[PDB]
Coordinates of C-alpha atoms (C1' of nucleotides) and ligand atoms in Angstrom, one line a residue:
Chain S
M1 CA 58.0 -81.5 -31.3
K2 CA 57.5 -77.8 -32.1
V3 CA 57.4 -76.5 -35.7
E4 CA 60.4 -77.7 -37.7
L5 CA 62.2 -74.8 -39.4
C6 CA 64.7 -74.5 -42.2
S7 CA 67.8 -72.3 -42.3
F8 CA 69.7 -70.2 -44.8
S9 CA 71.5 -73.5 -45.7
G10 CA 68.3 -75.5 -46.1
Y11 CA 69.2 -77.6 -43.0
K12 CA 66.6 -78.5 -40.4
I13 CA 66.6 -76.4 -37.3
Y14 CA 65.6 -78.3 -34.2
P15 CA 64.0 -76.4 -31.3
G16 CA 66.5 -74.6 -29.1
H17 CA 69.0 -74.1 -31.8
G18 CA 70.1 -71.0 -33.9
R19 CA 68.5 -67.6 -34.0
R20 CA 65.6 -66.0 -35.8
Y21 CA 66.0 -62.7 -37.7
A22 CA 63.1 -60.3 -38.3
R23 CA 63.8 -57.6 -40.8
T24 CA 62.2 -54.2 -40.9
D25 CA 60.5 -55.0 -44.2
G26 CA 58.5 -57.8 -42.5
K27 CA 60.4 -60.9 -43.7
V28 CA 61.5 -63.3 -41.0
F29 CA 64.5 -65.6 -41.3
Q30 CA 65.9 -68.4 -39.1
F31 CA 69.5 -69.6 -39.2
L32 CA 71.0 -72.8 -37.8
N33 CA 74.2 -71.2 -36.5
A34 CA 76.3 -68.1 -36.7
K35 CA 78.1 -69.5 -39.8
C36 CA 74.9 -69.6 -41.8
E37 CA 73.8 -66.3 -40.3
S38 CA 77.0 -64.5 -41.1
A39 CA 76.9 -65.8 -44.7
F40 CA 73.3 -64.5 -45.1
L41 CA 74.2 -61.1 -43.6
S42 CA 77.1 -60.7 -45.9
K43 CA 74.7 -61.3 -48.8
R44 CA 76.4 -64.5 -50.0
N45 CA 74.2 -66.6 -52.3
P46 CA 73.6 -70.1 -51.0
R47 CA 73.6 -71.5 -54.5
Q48 CA 77.4 -70.7 -54.6
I49 CA 78.2 -72.2 -51.2
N50 CA 79.1 -75.9 -51.7
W51 CA 77.8 -77.3 -48.4
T52 CA 74.3 -75.8 -48.9
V53 CA 71.2 -77.8 -49.8
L54 CA 70.4 -75.3 -52.5
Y55 CA 73.8 -75.7 -54.1
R56 CA 73.6 -79.5 -53.9
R57 CA 70.2 -79.8 -55.7
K58 CA 71.2 -77.1 -58.1
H59 CA 74.2 -79.1 -59.2
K60 CA 72.2 -82.3 -58.5
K61 CA 74.9 -83.7 -56.2
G62 CA 74.0 -87.2 -55.2
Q63 CA 70.5 -87.1 -56.7
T64 CA 57.3 -93.5 -71.6
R65 CA 54.4 -92.8 -73.9
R66 CA 50.8 -93.5 -72.9
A67 CA 47.3 -92.8 -74.2
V68 CA 43.9 -94.6 -74.0
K69 CA 40.5 -93.9 -75.5
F70 CA 37.3 -95.6 -74.3
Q71 CA 34.0 -95.9 -76.0
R72 CA 31.1 -94.3 -74.2
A73 CA 27.4 -94.0 -74.6
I74 CA 26.4 -90.7 -76.1
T75 CA 23.0 -89.2 -75.3
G76 CA 20.6 -90.7 -77.9
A77 CA 22.6 -93.9 -78.4
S78 CA 23.8 -96.5 -75.9
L79 CA 27.2 -98.2 -76.3
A80 CA 25.2 -101.1 -77.8
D81 CA 23.7 -98.9 -80.5
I82 CA 27.0 -97.4 -81.7
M83 CA 28.7 -100.8 -81.7
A84 CA 25.8 -102.3 -83.9
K85 CA 26.1 -99.3 -86.3
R86 CA 29.8 -99.7 -86.6
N87 CA 29.5 -103.5 -86.9
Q88 CA 27.4 -103.0 -90.1
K89 CA 30.9 -103.2 -91.7
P90 CA 30.7 -106.7 -93.3
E91 CA 29.0 -105.4 -96.5
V92 CA 25.9 -104.3 -94.5
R93 CA 27.4 -100.8 -94.7
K94 CA 28.0 -101.2 -98.4
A95 CA 24.4 -102.5 -98.6
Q96 CA 23.2 -99.2 -97.1
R97 CA 25.4 -97.0 -99.4
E98 CA 24.1 -98.6 -102.6
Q99 CA 20.3 -98.4 -101.8
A100 CA 20.7 -94.7 -101.1
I101 CA 22.1 -94.1 -104.6
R102 CA 19.1 -95.9 -106.2
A103 CA 16.9 -94.1 -103.7
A104 CA 18.3 -90.9 -105.0
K105 CA 18.6 -92.1 -108.7
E106 CA 14.8 -92.4 -109.3
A107 CA 14.4 -89.0 -107.5
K108 CA 17.0 -87.7 -110.0
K109 CA 14.7 -89.1 -112.7
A110 CA 11.9 -87.2 -111.1
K111 CA 14.2 -84.3 -110.7
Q112 CA 15.0 -84.3 -114.4
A113 CA 11.3 -83.8 -115.0
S114 CA 11.4 -81.2 -112.2
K115 CA 14.6 -79.5 -113.4
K116 CA 13.5 -79.5 -117.0
Chain Z
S1 CA 46.3 -63.0 -16.9
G2 CA 50.1 -63.5 -17.6
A3 CA 52.9 -61.1 -17.1
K4 CA 55.9 -60.5 -19.4
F5 CA 58.9 -62.7 -18.9
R6 CA 62.3 -61.3 -18.5
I7 CA 64.1 -60.5 -21.8
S8 CA 67.6 -59.2 -22.7
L9 CA 67.4 -55.4 -22.5
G10 CA 70.2 -54.1 -24.8
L11 CA 68.9 -50.5 -24.9
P12 CA 70.5 -48.4 -22.1
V13 CA 69.8 -44.8 -21.3
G14 CA 71.3 -42.6 -24.0
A15 CA 70.3 -45.0 -26.9
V16 CA 68.8 -43.3 -29.9
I17 CA 66.2 -45.5 -31.5
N18 CA 64.1 -45.0 -34.6
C19 CA 60.5 -43.8 -34.3
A20 CA 58.3 -46.2 -36.2
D21 CA 55.1 -44.2 -36.1
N22 CA 53.8 -41.3 -38.3
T23 CA 54.0 -38.7 -35.6
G24 CA 56.7 -36.8 -37.6
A25 CA 59.5 -37.8 -35.2
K26 CA 62.5 -39.6 -36.8
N27 CA 64.4 -40.8 -33.7
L28 CA 63.9 -41.2 -30.0
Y29 CA 66.7 -40.7 -27.3
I30 CA 65.9 -42.8 -24.3
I31 CA 66.4 -40.8 -21.1
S32 CA 65.0 -43.3 -18.6
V33 CA 63.0 -46.6 -18.3
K34 CA 59.8 -46.9 -16.3
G35 CA 59.8 -49.2 -13.3
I36 CA 63.6 -49.2 -12.9
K37 CA 64.7 -49.1 -9.3
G38 CA 68.3 -49.5 -10.3
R39 CA 71.6 -49.9 -8.5
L40 CA 74.9 -48.0 -8.2
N41 CA 76.5 -47.2 -11.5
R42 CA 74.0 -49.3 -13.5
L43 CA 72.3 -47.7 -16.5
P44 CA 68.6 -48.1 -16.7
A45 CA 68.0 -50.4 -19.8
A46 CA 64.9 -51.3 -21.7
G47 CA 63.8 -54.1 -24.0
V48 CA 60.8 -54.6 -26.4
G49 CA 57.5 -53.9 -24.6
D50 CA 59.2 -51.5 -22.1
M51 CA 57.8 -48.0 -21.5
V52 CA 60.5 -45.4 -21.7
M53 CA 60.8 -41.6 -21.5
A54 CA 62.4 -40.2 -24.6
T55 CA 63.1 -36.9 -26.4
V56 CA 63.1 -36.8 -30.1
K57 CA 66.4 -35.4 -31.4
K58 CA 65.5 -34.9 -35.1
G59 CA 62.0 -34.7 -36.3
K60 CA 59.4 -32.0 -36.2
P61 CA 60.0 -28.9 -34.1
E62 CA 56.8 -29.1 -32.1
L63 CA 57.9 -32.5 -30.8
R64 CA 61.6 -31.8 -30.2
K65 CA 62.4 -30.1 -26.9
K66 CA 60.0 -32.2 -24.8
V67 CA 59.9 -35.5 -22.9
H68 CA 57.6 -38.1 -24.5
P69 CA 56.5 -41.5 -23.1
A70 CA 57.5 -44.2 -25.6
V71 CA 57.3 -47.9 -25.9
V72 CA 60.1 -50.0 -27.5
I73 CA 58.6 -52.2 -30.3
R74 CA 61.8 -53.5 -31.9
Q75 CA 65.2 -54.3 -30.6
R76 CA 68.5 -55.4 -32.1
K77 CA 69.7 -57.3 -29.0
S78 CA 68.8 -61.0 -29.3
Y79 CA 66.4 -62.3 -26.7
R80 CA 65.0 -65.7 -25.7
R81 CA 61.3 -66.3 -26.0
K82 CA 60.7 -69.2 -23.5
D83 CA 60.4 -71.7 -26.4
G84 CA 64.0 -71.6 -27.3
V85 CA 64.0 -69.1 -30.2
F86 CA 66.5 -66.3 -30.0
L87 CA 64.9 -63.4 -31.9
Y88 CA 66.4 -60.1 -32.9
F89 CA 65.4 -57.4 -35.3
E90 CA 67.1 -55.3 -38.0
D91 CA 66.9 -52.1 -35.9
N92 CA 65.8 -50.6 -32.5
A93 CA 62.5 -49.0 -33.0
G94 CA 59.8 -47.5 -30.7
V95 CA 56.6 -45.5 -30.8
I96 CA 55.5 -42.4 -28.9
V97 CA 52.6 -43.1 -26.5
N98 CA 50.9 -41.4 -23.6
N99 CA 51.1 -42.5 -20.0
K100 CA 47.7 -44.2 -20.5
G101 CA 49.2 -46.4 -23.3
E102 CA 47.6 -44.9 -26.4
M103 CA 49.9 -44.3 -29.3
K104 CA 50.1 -40.6 -30.4
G105 CA 50.4 -41.7 -34.0
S106 CA 48.1 -43.9 -36.1
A107 CA 50.3 -46.4 -38.1
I108 CA 53.5 -48.4 -37.4
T109 CA 56.2 -49.0 -40.0
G110 CA 57.7 -52.5 -39.8
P111 CA 57.0 -55.4 -37.5
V112 CA 56.3 -55.3 -33.8
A113 CA 57.6 -57.7 -31.2
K114 CA 55.0 -60.1 -29.8
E115 CA 55.8 -59.1 -26.2
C116 CA 55.1 -55.4 -27.1
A117 CA 51.9 -56.4 -28.7
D118 CA 50.0 -58.3 -26.0
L119 CA 51.4 -55.9 -23.4
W120 CA 50.1 -52.9 -25.3
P121 CA 46.8 -53.6 -27.2
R122 CA 46.7 -50.1 -28.7
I123 CA 50.1 -50.6 -30.3
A124 CA 49.1 -54.2 -31.4
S125 CA 46.1 -53.0 -33.3
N126 CA 48.2 -50.5 -35.3
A127 CA 50.9 -53.1 -36.0
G128 CA 51.2 -54.1 -39.6
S129 CA 52.9 -57.4 -38.7
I130 CA 53.9 -59.2 -35.5
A131 CA 57.2 -61.0 -35.0
Chain P
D1 CA 33.3 -101.1 -58.1
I2 CA 33.4 -98.1 -55.8
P3 CA 29.8 -97.4 -54.5
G4 CA 28.3 -94.4 -56.3
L5 CA 31.4 -93.8 -58.5
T6 CA 32.2 -96.8 -60.8
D7 CA 28.6 -97.3 -61.7
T8 CA 25.7 -95.5 -63.5
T9 CA 28.0 -94.3 -66.3
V10 CA 27.1 -90.9 -67.6
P11 CA 26.9 -90.6 -71.4
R12 CA 28.7 -87.9 -73.4
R13 CA 26.1 -85.1 -73.6
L14 CA 26.1 -85.0 -77.4
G15 CA 27.8 -86.7 -80.2
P16 CA 30.3 -85.7 -82.9
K17 CA 29.4 -82.9 -85.3
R18 CA 32.2 -82.6 -87.9
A19 CA 31.6 -84.9 -90.9
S20 CA 34.9 -86.7 -90.1
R21 CA 34.5 -87.0 -86.4
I22 CA 31.4 -89.1 -87.0
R23 CA 33.3 -91.3 -89.6
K24 CA 36.0 -92.1 -87.1
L25 CA 33.5 -93.0 -84.4
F26 CA 31.3 -95.1 -86.7
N27 CA 33.9 -96.4 -89.3
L28 CA 32.2 -94.6 -92.2
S29 CA 34.2 -95.3 -95.4
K30 CA 32.8 -92.9 -98.0
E31 CA 29.2 -91.7 -98.8
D32 CA 27.7 -94.5 -96.7
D33 CA 24.6 -92.5 -95.8
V34 CA 26.7 -90.1 -93.7
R35 CA 23.8 -87.9 -92.8
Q36 CA 21.6 -90.6 -91.2
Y37 CA 24.5 -92.1 -89.1
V38 CA 24.8 -88.9 -87.1
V39 CA 23.4 -89.3 -83.6
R40 CA 19.9 -87.9 -83.2
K41 CA 19.2 -86.7 -79.7
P42 CA 15.6 -87.2 -78.5
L43 CA 13.8 -84.5 -76.5
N44 CA 11.1 -85.4 -74.0
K45 CA 9.3 -82.6 -72.1
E46 CA 6.1 -83.2 -70.2
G47 CA 4.3 -80.1 -71.5
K48 CA 5.0 -81.0 -75.1
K49 CA 4.9 -83.8 -77.6
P50 CA 7.9 -86.0 -77.9
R51 CA 10.4 -85.1 -80.6
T52 CA 14.0 -85.9 -81.6
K53 CA 16.5 -83.2 -82.6
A54 CA 19.4 -83.6 -85.0
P55 CA 22.4 -81.3 -85.3
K56 CA 23.9 -79.5 -88.3
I57 CA 26.9 -81.4 -89.5
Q58 CA 29.9 -79.3 -90.7
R59 CA 32.5 -79.9 -93.4
Chain B
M1 CA 40.3 -82.0 -46.1
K2 CA 38.2 -82.9 -49.0
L3 CA 39.2 -85.0 -52.0
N4 CA 37.6 -84.5 -55.5
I5 CA 37.7 -87.9 -57.2
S6 CA 36.8 -88.2 -60.9
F7 CA 36.9 -91.3 -63.1
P8 CA 37.0 -90.2 -66.8
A9 CA 35.9 -93.6 -68.1
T10 CA 32.6 -93.4 -66.2
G11 CA 32.4 -89.7 -65.2
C12 CA 30.4 -89.6 -62.0
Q13 CA 32.9 -87.6 -60.0
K14 CA 32.2 -87.4 -56.3
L15 CA 33.6 -85.7 -53.2
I16 CA 35.4 -87.5 -50.4
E17 CA 35.8 -86.0 -47.0
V18 CA 38.7 -87.2 -44.8
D19 CA 40.0 -86.1 -41.5
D20 CA 42.8 -88.7 -41.2
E21 CA 46.3 -87.6 -42.0
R22 CA 47.7 -91.1 -42.9
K23 CA 45.3 -91.8 -45.7
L24 CA 46.2 -88.3 -47.0
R25 CA 50.0 -88.5 -46.4
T26 CA 50.5 -90.9 -49.2
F27 CA 49.6 -88.0 -51.4
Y28 CA 51.7 -85.5 -49.5
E29 CA 55.0 -84.2 -50.9
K30 CA 53.8 -85.0 -54.5
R31 CA 53.6 -82.7 -57.4
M32 CA 50.8 -82.5 -60.0
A33 CA 50.3 -85.0 -62.8
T34 CA 52.0 -87.8 -60.8
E35 CA 50.1 -91.1 -60.4
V36 CA 49.8 -92.4 -56.9
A37 CA 48.1 -95.5 -55.5
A38 CA 45.2 -94.9 -53.1
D39 CA 45.6 -98.2 -51.2
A40 CA 45.6 -96.0 -48.0
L41 CA 41.8 -95.7 -47.6
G42 CA 40.1 -98.7 -46.1
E43 CA 39.9 -101.9 -48.1
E44 CA 37.8 -100.5 -51.0
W45 CA 40.3 -98.3 -52.7
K46 CA 42.6 -101.2 -53.6
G47 CA 44.2 -101.8 -57.0
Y48 CA 43.6 -98.1 -57.7
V49 CA 46.4 -95.8 -58.8
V50 CA 45.3 -92.2 -59.1
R51 CA 46.8 -89.1 -60.7
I52 CA 46.9 -85.7 -58.9
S53 CA 45.3 -83.2 -61.2
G54 CA 44.9 -80.2 -59.0
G55 CA 43.5 -78.8 -55.8
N56 CA 42.8 -75.6 -53.8
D57 CA 44.5 -73.8 -50.9
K58 CA 42.9 -73.2 -47.5
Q59 CA 42.1 -69.7 -48.9
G60 CA 40.7 -71.1 -52.1
Chain T
rA1 C1' 70.5 -64.1 3.4
rA2 C1' 67.3 -63.0 1.1
rU3 C1' 64.6 -58.3 -0.8
rC4 C1' 61.2 -55.3 -2.8
rC5 C1' 57.7 -54.2 -6.6
rU6 C1' 54.0 -54.8 -10.5
rG7 C1' 49.9 -57.1 -13.1
rC8 C1' 45.2 -60.4 -12.7
rU9 C1' 41.2 -61.8 -9.3
rC10 C1' 38.8 -60.0 -5.1
rA11 C1' 36.3 -55.5 -7.6
rG12 C1' 33.9 -50.3 -10.4
rU13 C1' 33.0 -54.3 -4.8
rA14 C1' 33.4 -52.3 0.7
rC15 C1' 33.2 -46.8 1.6
rG16 C1' 31.1 -42.3 -0.6
rA17 C1' 25.8 -37.6 -2.6
rG18 C1' 29.0 -38.0 -6.3
rA19 C1' 33.7 -37.8 -8.0
rG20 C1' 36.4 -41.4 -6.9
rG21 C1' 38.0 -46.0 -4.6
rA22 C1' 40.7 -50.2 -1.3
rA23 C1' 42.0 -54.8 1.6
rC24 C1' 42.6 -60.5 3.2
rC25 C1' 43.2 -65.5 0.6
rG26 C1' 44.8 -67.0 -4.4
rC27 C1' 47.4 -66.7 -9.3
rA28 C1' 51.3 -64.9 -12.9
rG29 C1' 55.6 -62.4 -13.1
rG30 C1' 59.5 -59.0 -12.3
rU31 C1' 63.7 -55.6 -9.1
rU32 C1' 68.0 -55.8 -6.0
rC33 C1' 71.0 -59.5 -3.9
rA34 C1' 73.0 -64.5 -3.4
rG35 C1' 74.9 -69.4 -5.0
rA36 C1' 75.9 -71.9 -9.3
rC37 C1' 76.1 -73.4 -14.5
rA38 C1' 77.4 -73.7 -20.2
rU39 C1' 72.1 -77.5 -23.0
rU40 C1' 71.0 -73.0 -25.7
rU41 C1' 72.4 -67.6 -27.6
rG42 C1' 76.6 -64.2 -27.2
rG43 C1' 82.0 -63.1 -26.3
rU44 C1' 87.0 -65.0 -26.6
rG45 C1' 90.1 -67.9 -29.7
rU46 C1' 97.6 -69.0 -31.4
rA47 C1' 93.5 -76.2 -31.2
rU48 C1' 98.2 -71.3 -34.8
rG49 C1' 92.0 -76.0 -36.8
rU50 C1' 90.6 -74.9 -41.9
rG51 C1' 89.8 -71.7 -46.3
rC52 C1' 91.1 -66.7 -48.5
rU53 C1' 94.9 -63.0 -49.2
rU54 C1' 99.5 -58.9 -49.5
rG55 C1' 105.1 -58.4 -49.8
rG56 C1' 109.2 -61.5 -49.9
rC57 C1' 111.9 -66.3 -50.0
rU58 C1' 112.9 -71.8 -51.2
rG59 C1' 114.7 -72.3 -59.8
rA60 C1' 109.0 -73.3 -61.1
rG61 C1' 104.6 -76.9 -59.9
rG62 C1' 103.3 -79.0 -55.4
rA63 C1' 104.4 -78.1 -50.4
rG64 C1' 105.7 -74.5 -47.3
rC65 C1' 108.0 -70.6 -44.5
rC66 C1' 109.3 -65.2 -42.7
rA67 C1' 106.7 -60.2 -41.7
rA68 C1' 107.9 -59.7 -32.7
rU69 C1' 100.1 -63.4 -33.6
rG70 C1' 101.4 -60.4 -41.5
rG71 C1' 96.1 -59.5 -42.4
rG72 C1' 91.3 -61.3 -42.6
rG73 C1' 86.5 -65.2 -42.7
rC74 C1' 84.7 -69.2 -40.2
rG75 C1' 85.8 -72.0 -35.8
rA76 C1' 86.2 -77.4 -31.7
rA77 C1' 87.3 -77.5 -26.7
rG78 C1' 87.8 -74.7 -22.5
rC79 C1' 86.7 -70.3 -19.9
rU80 C1' 82.8 -66.9 -19.7
Chain N
rU1 C1' 94.3 -109.0 -16.7
rG2 C1' 95.7 -103.7 -16.7
rG3 C1' 97.0 -99.0 -18.4
rG4 C1' 99.7 -96.9 -22.3
rU5 C1' 101.3 -95.8 -27.6
rC6 C1' 99.8 -96.1 -32.6
rG7 C1' 95.9 -97.4 -36.0
rG8 C1' 90.5 -97.6 -36.9
rG9 C1' 85.5 -96.0 -36.3
rG10 C1' 82.3 -92.0 -34.3
rU11 C1' 81.8 -86.7 -33.5
rU12 C1' 83.0 -82.1 -35.0
rU13 C1' 85.6 -77.7 -37.7
rC14 C1' 86.5 -75.6 -42.4
rG15 C1' 84.7 -75.8 -47.1
rU16 C1' 85.4 -79.3 -52.3
rA17 C1' 92.7 -81.0 -51.9
rC18 C1' 97.1 -82.6 -55.4
rG19 C1' 97.0 -84.8 -60.0
rU20 C1' 94.3 -86.0 -64.2
rA21 C1' 90.3 -84.9 -67.9
rG22 C1' 86.9 -81.5 -70.5
rC23 C1' 84.4 -79.4 -78.0
rA24 C1' 84.1 -75.0 -70.3
rG25 C1' 86.8 -70.6 -70.7
rA26 C1' 87.6 -63.3 -72.0
rG27 C1' 90.7 -64.0 -75.7
rC28 C1' 95.7 -64.3 -77.9
rA29 C1' 100.0 -66.7 -80.8
rG30 C1' 101.7 -70.5 -84.6
rC31 C1' 100.5 -74.8 -88.7
rU32 C1' 97.3 -75.0 -93.3
rC33 C1' 99.6 -81.0 -99.4
rC34 C1' 97.0 -81.1 -94.0
rC35 C1' 92.1 -79.0 -92.5
rU36 C1' 86.5 -77.9 -95.6
rC37 C1' 85.9 -76.4 -90.3
rG38 C1' 90.3 -77.9 -88.0
rC39 C1' 94.8 -78.7 -84.8
rU40 C1' 99.1 -77.1 -81.3
rG41 C1' 100.4 -73.9 -77.5
rC42 C1' 99.4 -69.6 -73.4
rG43 C1' 95.4 -68.3 -70.4
rA44 C1' 92.9 -66.2 -64.5
rU45 C1' 88.8 -68.8 -63.7
rC46 C1' 84.9 -73.1 -64.2
rU47 C1' 83.2 -78.3 -64.2
rA48 C1' 83.9 -83.8 -62.8
rU49 C1' 86.6 -87.0 -59.9
rU50 C1' 85.1 -84.4 -54.6
rG51 C1' 80.1 -82.6 -48.7
rA52 C1' 86.3 -83.7 -51.2
rA53 C1' 91.2 -82.6 -48.6
rA54 C1' 93.0 -81.5 -43.8
rG55 C1' 92.7 -81.4 -38.3
rU56 C1' 90.1 -83.5 -34.3
rC57 C1' 92.3 -84.6 -26.9
rA58 C1' 96.6 -82.7 -26.0
rG59 C1' 91.2 -82.3 -20.4
rC60 C1' 86.1 -85.3 -27.0
rC61 C1' 83.4 -90.7 -27.5
rC62 C1' 83.9 -96.3 -28.6
rU63 C1' 87.7 -99.7 -29.7
rC64 C1' 89.7 -105.1 -28.5
rG65 C1' 93.3 -104.4 -34.5
rA66 C1' 99.0 -103.8 -33.9
rC67 C1' 103.3 -102.9 -30.5
rA68 C1' 105.9 -103.0 -26.4
rC69 C1' 105.4 -102.6 -21.1
rA70 C1' 103.6 -103.9 -16.6
rA71 C1' 104.6 -108.5 -8.6
rG72 C1' 109.2 -102.7 -9.9
rG73 C1' 112.1 -99.1 -7.1
rG74 C1' 113.2 -95.8 -2.4
rU75 C1' 111.8 -93.9 2.9
rU76 C1' 109.4 -94.8 7.4
rU77 C1' 105.7 -96.5 10.9
rG78 C1' 104.2 -101.1 17.1
rU79 C1' 99.5 -101.1 21.7
Chain Y
rA1 C1' 24.6 -68.4 -73.6
rA2 C1' 29.3 -68.7 -75.7
rC3 C1' 33.4 -68.9 -79.3
rU4 C1' 34.7 -65.6 -83.4
rG5 C1' 35.1 -60.5 -85.9
rC6 C1' 34.9 -55.4 -84.8
rG7 C1' 34.8 -51.2 -81.4
rA8 C1' 36.5 -49.7 -76.9
rA9 C1' 43.0 -44.9 -79.3
rU10 C1' 36.4 -41.5 -81.0
rG11 C1' 33.6 -38.6 -77.8
rG12 C1' 33.5 -35.9 -72.9
rC13 C1' 36.4 -33.1 -68.9
rU14 C1' 40.3 -29.9 -67.3
rC15 C1' 44.4 -26.3 -68.3
rA16 C1' 48.8 -28.6 -64.1
rU17 C1' 53.0 -28.8 -67.1
rU18 C1' 55.0 -26.1 -71.3
rA19 C1' 58.5 -19.5 -73.3
rA20 C1' 61.1 -21.2 -80.6
rA21 C1' 58.5 -25.4 -76.6
rU22 C1' 53.0 -25.4 -77.8
rC23 C1' 50.6 -22.9 -81.5
rA24 C1' 49.6 -19.9 -86.2
rG25 C1' 50.6 -19.0 -91.4
rU26 C1' 54.0 -21.6 -95.2
rU27 C1' 56.4 -25.7 -97.2
rA28 C1' 58.7 -31.0 -97.5
rU29 C1' 58.6 -36.4 -96.8
rG30 C1' 62.8 -37.3 -104.0
rG31 C1' 63.3 -39.1 -95.5
rU32 C1' 58.0 -42.8 -93.5
rU33 C1' 53.7 -45.6 -91.5
rC34 C1' 48.5 -46.1 -92.4
rC35 C1' 42.5 -50.2 -89.8
rU36 C1' 38.9 -48.7 -92.9
rU37 C1' 36.6 -46.7 -98.0
rU38 C1' 37.2 -46.7 -103.4
rG39 C1' 39.6 -48.7 -107.6
rG40 C1' 43.3 -52.2 -109.3
rU41 C1' 45.3 -57.9 -108.3
rC42 C1' 43.8 -63.0 -106.9
rG43 C1' 44.7 -70.3 -113.2
rC44 C1' 50.8 -64.8 -114.6
rU45 C1' 54.6 -69.8 -110.4
rC46 C1' 55.3 -75.9 -114.8
rG47 C1' 55.9 -78.1 -108.9
rC48 C1' 45.6 -93.4 -101.7
rC49 C1' 41.5 -86.5 -98.7
rA50 C1' 40.7 -82.3 -102.8
rC51 C1' 33.4 -84.6 -103.7
rU52 C1' 36.8 -81.0 -98.1
rU53 C1' 42.4 -83.0 -93.9
rG54 C1' 44.0 -82.6 -88.3
rG55 C1' 43.7 -81.5 -82.8
rA56 C1' 41.8 -78.8 -78.9
rU57 C1' 38.5 -75.3 -76.7
rA58 C1' 34.0 -72.6 -75.5
rA59 C1' 29.0 -72.4 -74.3
rC60 C1' 26.6 -77.0 -71.9
rU61 C1' 26.2 -81.5 -67.8
rG62 C1' 28.6 -82.8 -63.3
rU63 C1' 32.2 -82.3 -58.4
rG64 C1' 33.9 -78.3 -55.5
rG65 C1' 37.4 -74.4 -52.9
rU66 C1' 37.3 -69.5 -51.0
rA67 C1' 35.1 -64.5 -45.7
rA68 C1' 35.2 -62.0 -50.0
rU69 C1' 36.1 -60.4 -56.3
rU70 C1' 33.4 -59.5 -63.2
rC71 C1' 38.4 -65.5 -58.8
rU72 C1' 38.4 -69.9 -60.6
rA73 C1' 40.1 -76.0 -60.6
rG74 C1' 39.5 -80.9 -61.7
rA75 C1' 36.2 -84.3 -64.9
Ligands
K201 K1 65.9 -45.5 -10.4
K202 K1 93.0 -68.2 -38.9
K203 K1 81.8 -68.5 -31.2
K204 K1 82.7 -71.4 -27.5
K205 K1 90.6 -80.9 -58.1
K206 K1 83.2 -81.0 -55.2
MG207 MG1 78.7 -43.7 -10.5
MG208 MG1 30.3 -74.8 -92.9
MG209 MG1 72.9 -59.4 6.5
MG210 MG1 102.4 -64.4 -50.9
MG211 MG1 102.5 -72.5 -55.5
MG212 MG1 115.0 -65.4 -42.6
MG213 MG1 111.8 -58.0 -38.1
MG214 MG1 84.7 -65.1 -34.8
MG215 MG1 91.2 -91.1 -33.7

RNA sequence: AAUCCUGCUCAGUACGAGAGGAACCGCAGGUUCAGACAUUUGGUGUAUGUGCUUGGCUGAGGAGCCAAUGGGGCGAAGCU
RNA sequence: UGGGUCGGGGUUUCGUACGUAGCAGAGCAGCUCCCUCGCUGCGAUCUAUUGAAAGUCAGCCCUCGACACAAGGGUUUGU
RNA sequence: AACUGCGAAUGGCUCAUUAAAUCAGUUAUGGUUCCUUUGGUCGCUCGCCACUUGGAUAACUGUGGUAAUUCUAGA
C-alpha cells in the first residue's frame, strides 16, 4: 500500500520489487527487473521494444458537431424587452420604418429652407 | 532519536571515490573507516553516511599529501532501505569534513543519500537534492 | 436549480455595438430606425441626477 | 481541493470546496475539454454533465 | 554460545571557581560470532530456454547443424 | 479407487514466428499500340496478421479429457 | 484603463578583443537592401451586402490558484 511506481517499461512496480537508480544529474529511475534495467542502461529506446507500454500505445496495439446560443438579459433591457422589440416583426417594424421617413421628410422640407 | 540501519557497504579500503564538494579535490582514496573493529583479513568497508579517513590523490596540492576525514554521500553498491527499495547511484562520491562533522566545502554536486543526510545535518543543508 | 448558482441570472454587461450585431440580435431588416433600437444603458448614482447613456454604433 | 463551477447560460459562477476523494475521482484521469457528469456530489448535482475547462496546480 | 560498541534520554544535570563533565533505569541501533533461509536484490546458468550474430555445411526458402559450451543479450528452476 | 503417460489450462522466459499481403522501402533493371502517370522484376529493412512463435518439471501449479496399467513378484521372521 | 500605430536598433558608458584586421584618404555597387521625408502612382485590368460583410479579443463585471513575480485560468 506504498506509493505505486512505474518502470522503464511502463509496468507497475509493487513494493519490494526491482531497484531504484539515482543518477548524478539528479534524476531518479525505478526498474521492475534487471531486464528493464539493462535495457535502460544500454540506452535502448522503449518505443522500439515491442513488449513495452510506450511501444504499445505508440503503435496503438489493442486500443460530432455542437453549438448553442442562449438569449440573455443585457443591462438596460430584460429578456422580455428584447423579445418584444424583436417581436415587432409582423409589420409593426415596417410601421416604425415608414413613420421615420415621413418624420425626416418634413424635416427635409424644413432643411430645404435651411440648406437654401 | 533513531540510529542508522545496516546497509550494504561496497567501498572497501583502497577505493578511490569522487569528491562532490568544491574544496578543489577531485578524488578521495579511502584509507580506513571509522568505528570498524574488524576481523582477520577483512577489509574495513564503508557505505553511504559512513565517516572515513581519506587522502586526495588528484586535486589541489595543499590538500594532497594529508589525511582528511570524509563522509560517503553516494555509493554504487545497491542497498536496501527497510521499505523494500534497492537503491544505488551512478557513482561513489564523498565529501571532505572535519572530525566535528562540518563540511570543509560549501556546495555539493549531485544528490546525497538520505541516510547520509539525517546522519549529517551539515551535509544535508548543502545537498542540492536528496535520494 | 442549484442554490445560488442556477438563479439570479446576471445580464450581459452591455449590448451590441456594431450596426450588424444589433440587427442579428433584434431582427432588423433595413433602415428600421436602427439607431433607436440600440440598447440604452441607464446610469443611477446617488450624488447625481438619473440619466441614460447610449453608445456610439460603428459601421 | 476547490472546484470552480460556472454556468454560461446564467453566469453566477461560484466556488465549491470538497475534501472527499470519491466525489472528485470521477473527474480524475480526465483531460481538458471533456464532458463529465457530476452525479457524484450528493443528490443535488444530478442530471448534470460538466466540462473540464481548466485548473491550477498545488503551486498555482 | 553468544560478544562488544555507539547514539538518544537521564543531562550542560551530579561534581567543579571555572574549564569541563558522568552514572543507574529506559529507548533505538550497530560490531564480532553463531544457526538458518531465498520473499526480495545480487551472482551463477549447457533448462543448451528464447532472440541476435561470424565462418562453414545440408542445391535455395523454411528448418537446422558443426566450430572440444562458436560468440554474445536476456533468462525459469535450483544453488548461493 | 490409485498412481502414471500424453493432452489441456495456469505460471513464467524470451521477444513479435513461417507464410501471405502492402501505392512501406535507399534505389536499380526491363515494357511503353499499352500507360497520360503506369506496370513487371531485384532489393537489406519496415508494417499487419502477431505481447506473436517457441519452451516451461525433468525436483513448477491445477486437471478429471484420452490411453494403458495396477490383489503382482522374491527372501525371511515365533513368546 | 485597454486594444491599435509608432519608438524602444538613437543616445549614454567602456576600450577587453582586434596588427591590411579596425581606421584614414580614394573609388565602385553597370553586384544590393532601405522605416521615414519629398515628389510621382492609386476608374490604365472589360471580370439578393456595396447605402458598408464576417468572427473573436481587450479594457470591464464575476470566481479563484500560488510563499512569491510586471504569473495568470475558467466564465
Ligand atoms: K580495526
Ligand atoms: K544462449
Ligand atoms: K539472474
Ligand atoms: K536465480
Ligand atoms: K511475420
Ligand atoms: K507483432
Ligand atoms: Mg592477512
Ligand atoms: Mg467608424
Ligand atoms: Mg566457548
Ligand atoms: Mg552462419
Ligand atoms: Mg535460411
Ligand atoms: Mg562434420
Ligand atoms: Mg575440431
Ligand atoms: Mg546474465
Ligand atoms: Mg503442461
